[PDB]
Amino acid sequence: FAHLQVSDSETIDLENLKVYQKVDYSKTAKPLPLYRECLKPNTEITFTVS
RNA sequence: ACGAGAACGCAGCACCAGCUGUCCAACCUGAAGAAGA
Known part of the structure; x- marks a missing residue:
């Protein structure tokens, strides 16, 4: 985790x-x-987690 | 009734000229609202 970069959730x-x-x-x-x-x-949320 | 008396070491003159208190550097590191209300 300390080298991972987790981001917030999107809309x-x-x-x-x-x-x-x-x-x-x-x-x-x-x-x-x-x-x-x-x-x-049946709601879809997206992320940008790399 | 003195090797004496009288006689400004004085006059003019900028401690001044040029010169970045600058150069490099992340306020950064690690950390769930669960849980028997």
């Missing part, structure tokens, strides 16, 4: 935003208090 789309619920997996799908807006699927 992430604005029309691909979709709020989602966080759920539990332990033998039941009980919702959890914290929610968050997220990014909807």
Whole structure:
């Protein structure tokens, strides 16, 4: 990494935003208090990482 | 009633002329918002 040059991410789309619920997996799908807006699927982002 | 008396070592004259406090040098190195809210 100290000889690698990782860069930032490029543009992430604005029309691909979709709020989602966080759920539990332990033998039941009980919702959890914290929610968050997220990014909807089938979105493509690009980089320039060499 | 003195080898004496009288007699400015004084007058004119720029410590001055030319000369980059410059040249080289990355404020740089190493470091996830996860996690049982």
